[PDB]
């Protein structure tokens, strides 16, 4: 029978179980419940990682040191193993024999206590072919009688949905709700456990490192409770140091190592940015300007907002940024966002809001459609953010989306979190939200039927106000109005489109060199203010790609290149010369 | 895959909850990373602490099959833990770990493989290298917050074009011998 039950008090003598710190009120109630003449069976109900298994085992630990009342002294605690109890019980009566034999020794001792971890498993432990004979029905008369004392442990999900379904078994137990300790209490717990973790990794943890692990975990590590969250960062930090090369090995765990661990656990950038990343931010704006010509104000808003986040000046309850890039066509509202992801090397979450025109399809970002029993549930936007917390979230053509989509982004832009239907929470604190719309292009473009031309370019904002609710616009960090491309800007665009063409030709081995005068001709021919810079692509396609297409497939341009493009002033037309 | 592995060695060198989970998409090398860790040990391309370690690949299908009894599953599964508990260096590679959360053997009960390994994983007795997809990680896994706590997710991202050509060059001898062909360097790119 000893194979099924492990004496926890023995482990305490050799140090098998870690010490329990605090929990004076939680533990005290357990003693009161155990002392009870009747129904002396406490139940430790709490979320995962809140010390449910450290209290029952910690009680045994306290007994060895004599830090418990005289009544609790001289009382051993046994931990039951359901797996061993149900091992090789094929024949009828085997399980009952093992279970009843255990209960008999407990009643005889009169000072023994049983600890059943994950007690939700005894409901149907011994049921066979629909049989109702289970550990719960067997133990029941011994709990109601009060002969034996049993300590339980189960999560709220399991307790409410499985353990509390049997209204008889639950009556016998006494739920002791355990609440996660405060930040102040958690650091004390780490100090108590720090000697064991320090010995295992042969490292020393600075007092500042302990406080940082707790404070940083809450700030960044979500979906896990504080005692586990902090111990996870501490244990992982020690391993990182122990296994790195002996040369440059550092026994002490400075506060900087803690920050690096939290970053990898949460997949976010680390605090106290390094010199290498500092160079990226210094030249982040100047790199985008090379790719995107004009509209520097937009780049200044994105880069400055990112710097604040990486400098510790963030909102702490909102995303890195929320910018509504409202502007005319072909002004670089989407190019800057696609290049930003490349510049920062972070995943680009691109959502085309043209699809989400009606409410039935808007429930795909936070949940699954009704009746979708398929296991592939979850929102498209919540799952994506969870996979990549550091990323760029682009919602193109946000105006086309049903107005109800603006209500979803309110919490994202104010609280920084969006919850899935299942209850999972996504953190937007590191995502650069960017929206692109053409709400006011027509209004400003609109001509005025009057003797005096109207002072346009003001009504554009008034149209944006009508499309977007005031609450949505208040949360926004800045509404960037993209201006129209000028003649000088278009010249740079032609260069940008020629470089891309050169790259395509480089794959085939062809080399292209456009005369500077010829580039000016292309720019003037295609320059359109209303159509932005997209027409420049078309003139590049008609003037250059169309003639070369026939030559590449057949002719001198099969390989070798040696192209020489120039224009004729007399004819105002291009001259293409290929010599392999 | 030294950046991903290094993280896994850190998790496997922990006092408690030393069970690295290789979460990722489908086809991004989740299984190879775990089986690769064994290949690297044989050649001595791993730290000293990781040396003298064996990786066991669990087969839930074979284990569950043939039970036909109340305690057959528990008997064979518990015996496996004794082997892993006695051998401190033994590591268990449970591929498609999402399956253990669902009742493996139990029917109308909660005595599953997941609820049996939780006590051992919490105390650091045995290490477990799990592998699961992102869709399975969200909807099958993470529904039992207790088990998810024991496992430290290690996101595995798709490799770049340049990184993959190195991979093909590494695996080119295996396919060359099987097909008796020679893949040109330009062809793989």
């Amino acid at each position: 029978t000893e194979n099924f039950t492990t004496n926890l008090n023995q482990l305490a003598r050799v140090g098998g179980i870690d010490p329990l710190i605090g929990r004076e009120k939680e533990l005290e109630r357990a003693i009161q419940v155990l002392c009870r003449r009747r129904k002396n069976n406490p139940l430790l109900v709490g979320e995962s990682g809140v010390g449910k298994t450290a209290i029952a085992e910690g009680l045994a630990w306290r007994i060895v040191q004599g830090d418990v009342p005289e009544v609790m002294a001289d009382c051993t605690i046994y931990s039951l193993d359901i797996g061993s109890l149900l091992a090789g019980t094929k024949y009828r009566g085997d399980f009952e024999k093992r279970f009843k034999a255990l209960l008999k020794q407990l009643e005889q001792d009169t000072n023994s206590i049983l600890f059943i971890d994950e007690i939700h498993t005894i409901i149907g432990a011994g049921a066979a072919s629909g049989g109702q004979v289970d550990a719960a029905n067997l133990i029941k008369p011994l709990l109601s009688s009060g002969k034996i004392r049993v300590i339980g442990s189960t999560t709220y999900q399991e307790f409410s949905n499985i353990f509390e379904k049997d209204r008889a078994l639950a009556r016998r137990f006494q739920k002791i709700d355990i609440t996660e300790p405060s930040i102040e209490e958690t650091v004390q717990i780490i100090n108590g456990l720090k000697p064991k973790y320090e010995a295992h990794h042969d490292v020393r943890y600075t007092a500042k490192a302990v406080r940082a692990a707790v404070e940083l975990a809450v700030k960044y590590i979500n979906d896990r409770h504080l005692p586990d969250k902090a111990i996870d960062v501490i244990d992982e930090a020690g391993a990182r140091a122990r296994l790195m090369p002996v040369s440059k090995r550092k026994k002490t765990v400075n506060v900087a190592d803690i920050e690096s661990v939290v970053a990898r656990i949460a997949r976010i950038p680390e605090k106290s940015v390094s010199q290498s990343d500092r160079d990226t931010l210094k030249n982040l704006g100047d790199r985008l300007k090379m790719l995107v010509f004009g509209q520097d104000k937009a780049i200044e808003a994105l880069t400055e907002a990112i710097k604040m986040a990486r400098a510790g000046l963030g909102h702490e309850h909102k995303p890195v940024g929320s910018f509504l890039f409202a502007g005319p066509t072909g002004v670089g509202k989407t190019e800057v966002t696609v290049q930003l992801s490349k510049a920062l090397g972070i995943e680009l979450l691109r959502f085309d809001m043209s699809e989400y025109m009606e409410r039935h399809t808007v429930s795909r970002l936070i949940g699954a459609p009704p009746g979708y029993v398929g296991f592939d549930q979850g929102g498209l936007l919540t799952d994506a953010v969870i996979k990549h917390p550091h990323a760029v979230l682009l919602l193109d053509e946000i105006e086309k989306a049903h107005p109800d989509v603006f209500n979803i982004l309110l919490q994202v832009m104010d609280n920084g979190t969006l919850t899935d239907n299942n209850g999972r929470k996504a953190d937007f604190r590191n995502v650069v939200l960017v929206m692109t719309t053409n709400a006011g292009v027509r209004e400003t473009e609109r001509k005025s039927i009057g003797l005096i031309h109207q002072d346009n370019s003001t009504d554009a904002m008034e149209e944006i106000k009508k499309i977007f609710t005031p609450e949505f616009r208040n949360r926004l960090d800045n509404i960037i109005w993209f201006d129209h491309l000028s003649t000088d800007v278009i010249h740079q665009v032609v260069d940008k489109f020629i470089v891309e063409l050169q790259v395509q030709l480089d794959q085939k081995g062809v080399s292209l060199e456009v005369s500077q005068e010829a580039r000016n001709w292309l720019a003037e021919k295609g320059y359109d203010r209303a159509m932005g810079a997209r027409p420049m692509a078309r003139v590049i396609q008609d003037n250059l790609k169309k003639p070369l297409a026939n030559e590449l497939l057949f002719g001198s341009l099969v390989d070798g290149g040696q192209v020489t493009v120039a224009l004729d002033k007399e004819k105002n037309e291009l001259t293409y010369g290929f010599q392999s | 895959r030294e950046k991903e592995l290094e993280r896994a060695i850190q998790v496997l060198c922990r006092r408690r909850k030393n069970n690295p989970l290789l979460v990722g998409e489908s086809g991004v090398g989740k299984t190879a990373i775990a089986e690769g860790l064994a290949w690297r040990i044989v050649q001595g391309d791993v730290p000293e602490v990781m040396a003298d370690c064996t990786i066991y690949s669990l087969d839930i299908g074979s284990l569950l099959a043939g039970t036909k009894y109340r305690g057959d599953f528990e008997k064979r599964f518990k015996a496996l833990l004794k082997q892993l508990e006695q051998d401190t260096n033994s590591i268990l590679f449970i591929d498609e770990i999402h399956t253990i959360i669902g009742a493996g053997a139990a029917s109308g009960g909660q005595v599953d493989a997941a609820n049996l390994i939780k006590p051992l994983l919490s105390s650091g007795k045995i290490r477990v290298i799990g592998s699961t997809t992102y869709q399975e990680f969200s909807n099958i896994f993470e529904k039992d917050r207790a088990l998810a706590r024991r496992f430290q997710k290690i996101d595995i991202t798709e490799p770049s074009i340049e990184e993959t050509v190195q991979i093909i060059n590494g695996l080119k001898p295996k396919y060359e011998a099987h097909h008796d062909v020679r893949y040109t360097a330009k062809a793989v790119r």
Binding site: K90, Y91, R92, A128, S129 | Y69, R70, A105
Partner: peptide
């Protein structure tokens, strides 16, 4: 499923 079998020893 989980069925209990009663064995019979030889006489």
């Amino acid at each position: 499923e989980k069925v209990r079998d009663a064995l019979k020893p030889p006489s």
